[PDB]
């Protein structure tokens with residue numbers, strides 16, 4: 001359960017990073 | 029613990045992401 | 059100005075959450 | 089196994105985050 005939780009939290013971060021890259025593209 | 033260490037590393041990363049999103053918001057307002 | 063404001067509100071909130079997660083992680087090492 | 093994989097996934101993320109700060113720096117001078 002502890003590892004499962006961590007892998008889901010890491011997965012979430014990748015989506016936040018992806019979004020930021022698109023938002024920078026918009027604003028460059 | 030290896031797990032304790034990891035939770036602190038995740039926390040740190042989220043702080044760095046938060047900071048970037050502030051900088052972007054600021055830039056968009058001009 | 060509208061989305062600009064709301065994106066700043068969101069950014070501020072994520073900074074607060076990051077800070078809290080760090081303190082929870084640390085509290086566990088205590 | 090599990091931990092090795094997580095630590096490498098975390099390391100990778102910090103690399104992507106670092107790269108983004110290089111772009112922000114550029115934009116805040118432009």
Ligand code: NA
Pocket residue numbers: 001002003005006
């Ligand atoms: Na966990």
Ligand code: NA
Pocket residue numbers: 002005006
């Ligand atoms: Na967890």
Ligand code: NA
Pocket residue numbers: 015016017019020
């Ligand atoms: Na994001």
Ligand code: NA
Pocket residue numbers: 027028114115118
């Ligand atoms: Na630019």
Ligand code: NA
Pocket residue numbers: 013016042045046072
């Ligand atoms: Na986050």
Ligand code: NA
Pocket residue numbers: 043044045047048109
């Ligand atoms: Na940062």
Ligand code: NA
Pocket residue numbers: 048049050052053065069
């Ligand atoms: Na933002």
Ligand code: NA
Pocket residue numbers: 072
């Ligand atoms: Na969010």
Ligand code: NA
Pocket residue numbers: 073074075077078
């Ligand atoms: Na806080």
Ligand code: NA
Pocket residue numbers: 077078080081
């Ligand atoms: Na804190």
Ligand code: NA
Pocket residue numbers: 096097098100101
């Ligand atoms: Na990764």
Ligand code: NA
Pocket residue numbers: 103104105107108
């Ligand atoms: Na990147």
